[PDB]
Amino acid sequence: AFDLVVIGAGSGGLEAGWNAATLYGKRVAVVDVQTSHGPPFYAALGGTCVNVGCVPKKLMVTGAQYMDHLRESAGFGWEFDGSSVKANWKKLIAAKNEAVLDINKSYEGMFNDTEGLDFFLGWGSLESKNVVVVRETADPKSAVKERLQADHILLATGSWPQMPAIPGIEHCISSNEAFYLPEPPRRVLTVGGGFISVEFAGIFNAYKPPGGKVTLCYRNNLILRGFDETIREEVTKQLTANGIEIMTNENPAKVSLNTDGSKHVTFESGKTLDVDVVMMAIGRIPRTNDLQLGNVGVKLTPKGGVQVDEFSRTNVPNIYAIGDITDRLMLTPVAINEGAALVDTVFGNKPRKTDHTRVASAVFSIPPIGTCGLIEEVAAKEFEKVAVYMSSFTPLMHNISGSKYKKFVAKIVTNHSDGTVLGVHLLGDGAPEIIQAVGVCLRLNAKISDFYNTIGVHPTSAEELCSMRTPSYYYVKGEKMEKLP
Amino acid sequence: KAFDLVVIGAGSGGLEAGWNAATLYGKRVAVVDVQTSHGPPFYAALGGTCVNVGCVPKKLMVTGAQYMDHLRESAGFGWEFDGSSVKANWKKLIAAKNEAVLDINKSYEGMFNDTEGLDFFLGWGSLESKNVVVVRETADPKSAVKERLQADHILLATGSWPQMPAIPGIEHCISSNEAFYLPEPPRRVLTVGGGFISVEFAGIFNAYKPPGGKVTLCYRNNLILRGFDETIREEVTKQLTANGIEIMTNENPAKVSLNTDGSKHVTFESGKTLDVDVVMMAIGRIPRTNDLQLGNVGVKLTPKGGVQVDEFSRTNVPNIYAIGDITDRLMLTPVAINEGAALVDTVFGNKPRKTDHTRVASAVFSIPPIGTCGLIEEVAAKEFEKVAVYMSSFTPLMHNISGSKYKKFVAKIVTNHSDGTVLGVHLLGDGAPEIIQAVGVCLRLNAKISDFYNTIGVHPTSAEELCSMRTPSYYYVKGEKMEKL
Numbered sequence: 018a019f020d021l022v023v024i025g026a027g028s029g030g031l032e033a034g035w036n037a038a039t040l041y042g043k044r045v046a047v048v049d050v051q052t053s054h055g056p057p058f059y060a061a062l063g064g065t066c067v068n069v070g071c072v073p074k075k076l077m078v079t080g081a082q083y084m085d086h087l088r089e090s091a092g093f094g095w096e097f098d099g100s101s102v103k104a105n106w107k108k109l110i111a112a113k114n115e116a117v118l119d120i121n122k123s124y125e126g127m128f129n130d131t132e133g134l135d136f137f138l139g140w141g142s143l144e145s146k147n148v149v150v151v152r153e154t155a156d157p158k159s160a161v162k163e164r165l166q167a168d169h170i171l172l173a174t175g176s177w178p179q180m181p182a183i184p185g186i187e188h189c190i191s192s193n194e195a196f197y198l199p200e201p202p203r204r205v206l207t208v209g210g211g212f213i214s215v216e217f218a219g220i221f222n223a224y225k226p227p228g229g230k231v232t233l234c235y236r237n238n239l240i241l242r243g244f245d246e247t248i249r250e251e252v253t254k255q256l257t258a259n260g261i262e263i264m265t266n267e268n269p270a271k272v273s274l275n276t277d278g279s280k281h282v283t284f285e286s287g288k289t290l291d292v293d294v295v296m297m298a299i300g301r302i303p304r305t306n307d308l309q310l311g312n313v314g315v316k317l318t319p320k321g322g323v324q325v326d327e328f329s330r331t332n333v334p335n336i337y338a339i340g341d342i343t344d345r346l347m348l349t350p351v352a353i354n355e356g357a358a359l360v361d362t363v364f365g366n367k368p369r370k371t372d373h374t375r376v377a378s379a380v381f382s383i384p385p386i387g388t389c390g391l392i393e394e395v396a397a398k399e400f401e402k403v404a405v406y407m408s409s410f411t412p413l414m415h416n417i418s419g420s421k422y423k424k425f426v427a428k429i430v431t432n433h434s435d436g437t438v439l440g441v442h443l444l445g446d447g448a449p450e451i452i453q454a455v456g457v458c459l460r461l462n463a464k465i466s467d468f469y470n471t472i473g474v475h476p477t478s479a480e481e482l483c484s485m486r487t488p489s490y491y492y493v494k495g496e497k498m499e500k501l502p
Numbered sequence: 503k504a505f506d507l508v509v510i511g512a513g514s515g516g517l518e519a520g521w522n523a524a525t526l527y528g529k530r531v532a533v534v535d536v537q538t539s540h541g542p543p544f545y546a547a548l549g550g551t552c553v554n555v556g557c558v559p560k561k562l563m564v565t566g567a568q569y570m571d572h573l574r575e576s577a578g579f580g581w582e583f584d585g586s587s588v589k590a591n592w593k594k595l596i597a598a599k600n601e602a603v604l605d606i607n608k609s610y611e612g613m614f615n616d617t618e619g620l621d622f623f624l625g626w627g628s629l630e631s632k633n634v635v636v637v638r639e640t641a642d643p644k645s646a647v648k649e650r651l652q653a654d655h656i657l658l659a660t661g662s663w664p665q666m667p668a669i670p671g672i673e674h675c676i677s678s679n680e681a682f683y684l685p686e687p688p689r690r691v692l693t694v695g696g697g698f699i700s701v702e703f704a705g706i707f708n709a710y711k712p713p714g715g716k717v718t719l720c721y722r723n724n725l726i727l728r729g730f731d732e733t734i735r736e737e738v739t740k741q742l743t744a745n746g747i748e749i750m751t752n753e754n755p756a757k758v759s760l761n762t763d764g765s766k767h768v769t770f771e772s773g774k775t776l777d778v779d780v781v782m783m784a785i786g787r788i789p790r791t792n793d794l795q796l797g798n799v800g801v802k803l804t805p806k807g808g809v810q811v812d813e814f815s816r817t818n819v820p821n822i823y824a825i826g827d828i829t830d831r832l833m834l835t836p837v838a839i840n841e842g843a844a845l846v847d848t849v850f851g852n853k854p855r856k857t858d859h860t861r862v863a864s865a866v867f868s869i870p871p872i873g874t875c876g877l878i879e880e881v882a883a884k885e886f887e888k889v890a891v892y893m894s895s896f897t898p899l900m901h902n903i904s905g906s907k908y909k910k911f912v913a914k915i916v917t918n919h920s921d922g923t924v925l926g927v928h929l930l931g932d933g934a935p936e937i938i939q940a941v942g943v944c945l946r947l948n949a950k951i952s953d954f955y956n957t958i959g960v961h962p963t964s965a966e967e968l969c970s971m972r973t974p975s976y977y978y979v980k981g982e983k984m985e986k987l
């Protein structure tokens with residue numbers, strides 16, 4: 018039967034499926050490859066976010082921040098036995114595991130008491146345009162155990178870590194394995210400039226044993242591509258100031274094992290480095306190869322993502338795709354938004370589509386980032402006159418903390434014609450929390466004057482966004498100079 | 503000496519006015535204050551109450567006090583150290599706060615020194631005549647004249663002063679002013695008042711008290727923090743009690759006597775007794791009109807005691823104005839600052855401006871803190887016929903792991919249900935003050951509840967919860983509460 022079958026019980030899949038059984042009394046199947054977090058498939062019921070993404074990572078960052086809190090407390094008069102201090106990775110992971118497994122179970126409970134909503138363990142594939150094969154493994158020639166007849170098929174299998182084709186890649190891990198290392202690595206190399214590499218660099222930096230060293234490498238000049246440039250250079254500096262070695266214009270060429278089990282990394286430049294863990298975080302790719310999409314001619318974009326329209330529909334009439342598989346904005350709240358939007362269009366004539374512009378996102382680096390809308394060099398290309406407001410203060414408390422390097426950065430980008438805010442980019446503690454309501458402002462087509470005529474809350478870092486009245490420089494036609502001529 | 507503007511009180515509102523008039527419109531400005539830096543004998547100084555004995559030093563001290571929690575909470579995330587080696591040094595906190603405040607003092611001098619048309623005068627300002635501010639050596643009219651400043655315009659900006667009740671033994675009590683300079687942290691302390699100052703200091707003393715210590719907060723009425731949201735009022739009461747602070751509602755001191763060792767024997771009106779080492783009165787703050795000689799020129803006061811002003815900060819006497827705490831409206835730094843800016847724009851610029859006093863975001867730095875903007879349920883139910891109340895409250899995952907399960911987060915949105923416009927937002931928990939800032943911008947844009955829940959969330963954050971409340975938890979219709987329509 019089944020009005021809807023969902024392949025992938027993640028952020029997008031679970032929302033679409035719940036908004037259908039409960040909202041419209043439809044019959045829904047959901048397929049995922051595990052009931053609980055962990056090896057060998059890592060992602061499981063709940064999604065990447067719940068099992069090996071946003072949720073456990075936040076807890077681990079929050080754990081890592083305590084290295085700073087402990088150090089910084091001395092400036093405020095706190096003393097304790099310094100050389101009795103121990104960062105217990107194993108207690109942290111155990112505490113993370115129980116937190117995730119609690120959510121695993123709650124969804125398990127959700128399924129086992131909601132009619133029109135049933136869950137099927139195993140690997141979903143596309144047999145025909147109205148049937149989904151639930152096999153036992155990813156092997157297409159493994160035992161079948163269900164064949165779900167479907168009116169509507171939703172593809173929500175998420176994304177998967179990218180690995181470059183070098184010798185020794187088997188000895189490298191991804192973020193997935195990072196969540197389940199039995200020991201915190203003494204020497205670790207995270208590969209890539211993206212947010213995952215940066216966040217884990219901070220986590221490992223906090224929990225590493227004595228004699229330790231995190232190194233982060235990037236093949237190009239400046240990490241965190243696609244983020245505001247001043248923020249990119251500052252985060253680089255502040256990570257450096259907290260002991261992380263940032264190693265740009267380098268890329269691993271091979272990886273051999275040493276006689277102790279550690280990794281001997283050789284870079285393209287000929288430079289070498291011995292580490293205990295090599296974590297590849299060079300990209301996330303859409304997870305399509307186990308779905309047998311060739312069997313029904315489901316089309317892909319030039320980059321291996323499932324092509325869809327503004328209503329999440331493929332070339333195949335009653336097959337849909339949401340979340341990370343579409344290779345767009347890889348964010349849990351967007352995948353959730355797409356899932357809820359997909360349903361009420363199809364199962365309730367409430368035609369909603371998701372807005373992908375001006376979406377607030379964070380990066381829980383130490384220090385963290387918050388961002389919404391366009392960066393300045395992008396805004397310059399589809400607007401005639403762009404204004405950039407910039408304020409970079411060392412917060413109140415870090416004069417005392419001993420963490421003088423912790424500069425807060427606040428940047429607003431406008432179409433200077435009418436002063437509409439196109440972008441807002443924040444660096445420093447609080448940024449992720451500050452930016453959320455900035456999302457709401459941008460959605461209300463807020464102008465710069467709406468910010469600086471708003472009365473500040475003092476003392477806050479957020480305050481700064483209401484204290485910038487005059488541009489620092491402009492972009493006209495795409496050119497950067499200080500004064501408007 | 504002849505000037506365009508003479509400002510009495512070099513504080514939040516005063517300085518902003520003087521700086522703006524001098525730097526934006528090239529006017530000749532004199533600013534008067536009794537000290538160039540913080541502390542005894544006059545506490546407030548160049549920079550204002552906020553810089554010297556207010557928002558700035560109290561935040562640093564709250565931040566200091568938060569490390570008690572962080573150190574305890576770190577164990578949940580695998581941090582190990584000798585807990586019996588932990589102790590807080592109060593003199594180091596005070597010393598560090600002193601440096602930070604001093605640098606702002608030092609910075610404000612040098613602003614005067616380098617900006618022409620903007621001069622500082624040390625001493626006590628007063629109205630001799632409608633165009634003459636007299637500066638004397640002391641607050642006493644009999645003291646020697648130092649200057650007689652001719653003025654086209656006079657701005658009164660002397661702030662407020664701690665109200666001290668007229669009970670016997672009041673001499674043995676202190677105010678916030680002296681609390682900032684205590685040589686030792688009080689083992690036992692009574693903070694008298696239900697307002698934000700008392701609460702914040704109770705948290706500070708709670709963290710820094712020595713072994714066997716006890717903070718007690720008393721308040722003559724039933725529930726602390728009048729004017730704030732009732733759930734938050736009741737929660738922060740629980741969370742303070744949960745962290746070891748004894749709350750003493752419906753109680754009020756009647757007298758104080760000295761014990762043999764120098765401690766304080768408080769007797770309440772109810773007859774109950776309590777021994778403490780410090781009694782800090784924070785029962786209110788009253789406009790500082792004592793020493794300004796307002797009767798000489800006939801400046802009128804409100805029946806409440808503040809300087810009466812129209813919406814453009816004008817007194818009854820032409821060319822004499824007043825802003826900030828002396829007007830006895832919203833005793834907040836940014837409001838005074840906005841009032842000063844609006845005043846200088848109007849008088850010396852060619853466009854009238856006035857401070858909007860509604861929908862002003864504000865904070866309380868309890869642990870955890872409050873962030874709030876707009877109306878509370880009860881006030882909204884008098885103004886509007888139909889009122890919705892969206893609510894969300896839970897102990898966040900982080901704190902279930904931390905061990906501080908008492909730390910229940912609270913988000914609330916008050917709406918006029920007729921059109922859905924947000925009238926009030928209220929928050930309790932980590933990052934609340936940072937979150938609420940951009941919420942101030944939203945409300946200025948007359949945002950509706952739909953604009954929040956249709957905005958895409960940032961995950962994982964506390965703020966996210968503001969964009970996830972789609973149906974009212976209850977309603978207020980025609981003034982009456984009900985769980986339904």
Ligand SMILES: Cc1cc2nc3c(=O)[nH]c(=O)nc-3n(C[C@H](O)[C@H](O)[C@H](O)COP(=O)(O)OP(=O)(O)OC[C@H]3O[C@@H](n4cnc5c(N)ncnc54)[C@H](O)[C@@H]3O)c2cc1C
Pocket residue numbers: 024025026027028029030048049050051058060061062063064065066067069070071074139140141142173174175176192213304307308339340341342346347348349350352961962
């Ligand atoms: C380390 C890390 C940190 C992140 N942090 C954040 C963050 O802070 N904020 C944020 O917004 N986003 C974050 N993300 C991204 C976020 O997790 C994804 O955007 C989100 O999970 C997308 O949801 P989805 O439904 O598209 O895919 P997912 O939620 O990943 O769901 C895919 C699910 O489908 C299952 N599956 C796959 N193939 C099959 C098959 N053939 N048959 C059956 N089941 C299958 C998988 O087991 C998986 O559980 C992070 C990602 C990573 C890797």
Ligand SMILES: Cc1cc2nc3c(=O)[nH]c(=O)nc-3n(C[C@H](O)[C@H](O)[C@H](O)COP(=O)(O)OP(=O)(O)OC[C@H]3O[C@@H](n4cnc5c(N)ncnc54)[C@H](O)[C@@H]3O)c2cc1C
Pocket residue numbers: 475476510511512513514515516534535536537544546547548549550551552553555556557558560625626627628659660661662678699790793794825826827828832833834835836838
């Ligand atoms: C403990 C405490 C905590 C606070 N926390 C916050 C907060 O977190 N956020 C917030 O927004 N607000 C806070 N406030 C309120 C804030 O400090 C005031 O609202 C603000 O300082 C008012 O500024 P003002 O310009 O009215 O006068 P003030 O800033 O108070 O300055 C007035 C100045 O006038 C001087 N003066 C007085 N008499 C004379 C005279 N005769 N001649 C010359 N000079 C004179 C004084 O020395 C003083 O420096 C706090 C207040 C206190 C007491």
Ligand SMILES: c1cc2cc(-c3ncc(C4(N5CCCC5)CCCCC4)s3)ccc2[nH]1
Pocket residue numbers: 031032035123124126127128130
């Ligand atoms: C019986 C019902 C039941 C429901 C839940 C839910 N958890 C989260 C739920 C929600 N979504 C998120 C992922 C798909 C469901 C839907 C209702 C509340 C908002 C989250 S419902 C969890 C356990 C349950 N047991």
Ligand SMILES: c1cc2cc(-c3ncc(C4(N5CCCC5)CCCCC4)s3)ccc2[nH]1
Pocket residue numbers: 517518519521609610611612613614616
């Ligand atoms: C040496 C120090 C020095 C400091 C300043 C200022 N610091 C803060 C200033 C501002 N205010 C604070 C109170 C009214 C002026 C004015 C600019 C906006 C931010 C704060 S101006 C200006 C010139 C200075 N020369």
Ligand SMILES: c1cc2cc(-c3ncc(C4(N5CCCC5)CCCCC4)s3)ccc2[nH]1
Pocket residue numbers: 540541542543600680683684685
């Ligand atoms: C610049 C001046 C300055 C002055 C003080 C104090 N002055 C008086 C102080 C007090 N002295 C009395 C003798 C022991 C404590 C008296 C005022 C109340 C707090 C302590 S603290 C503290 C910090 C200061 N920085």
